[PDB]
Amino acid sequence: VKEFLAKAKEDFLKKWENPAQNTAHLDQFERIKTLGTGSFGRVMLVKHMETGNHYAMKILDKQKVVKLKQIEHTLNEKRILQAVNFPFLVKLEFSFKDNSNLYMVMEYVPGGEMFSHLRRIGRFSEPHARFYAAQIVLTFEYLHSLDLIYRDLKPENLLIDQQGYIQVTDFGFAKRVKGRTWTLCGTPEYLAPEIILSKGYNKAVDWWALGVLIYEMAAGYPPFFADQPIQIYEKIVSGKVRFPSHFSSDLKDLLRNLLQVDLTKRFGNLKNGVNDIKNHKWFATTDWIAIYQRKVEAPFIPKFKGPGDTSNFDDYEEEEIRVSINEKCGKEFSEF
């Protein structure tokens, strides 16, 4: 492993130091349908005419990115994405920009969001939940080894590929940092106590989010929920969690450790790093090597009907893509 990571850090660093730019053009793609919509952009299923491949094209409105002060975060996202490589991280195939928008073209994950399947099914059995959790454990070990913090773990950002494996998406909050960071960002239900308390935090917030994920996947609902964020924040910092009666004793033990408000006792952040997680009882049946190689039997296989199919994604209101006659935020995005 430490051998694998060593070589991984070498490849990341070369790309990190010399990121690729403008590797494609808007008119090389056929705009098909919207797969998701955000505050400063949207993602559409796209088709590359030269190869006939389908991709997920993320279109970000430069002016909106500026109004929401997400410039540096957007630069982080593209720069990090074009340099990483793991089987559970979606691939950035191309990136470019025009007068009005920034564009990031990634691999299309037809399976849809874990969110959708989770809410429909209700809850995943422990073996199912464990299968996905394992993948997040290795992905974080990988990312963290690169001095990267992900900061936005949740079902909405995890996709299921054809083989039933996870593909982490949305790196808008990803950041390479040695030392503490203070940006308040993420999603309410998944924010660690340190973040909500504005006290400088590190990679340990990712391990806490994992604890929230595993709980939600297994119970069908998050450990901390309420109609308004402030109520949720109040629960998160209280350091009080209740477990369904069906949670195995080992599952509860793993979560008590991950959902530790005291980030000096929180698993993943201790002296033995991720191993305190990997060597945990709840993970005894887990073969980490098998998972990384994708040779483990997937519990759920989302099936589709050929490429270009979007039935596993909700429908969104379409909106024509417009590009002004004038460049809009040149200097802000020069490095993109």
């Binding site: 960002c185 609902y221 109609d227």
Partner: peptide, 20 residues
């Protein structure tokens, strides 16, 4: 049941991220 309280809450849809 917690499940019932969750399903009846306004937080069962896609949750938006926060920052500012």
């Amino acid at each position: 049941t917690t499940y019932a309280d969750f399903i009846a809450s306004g937080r069962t849809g896609r949750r938006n991220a926060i920052h500012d």
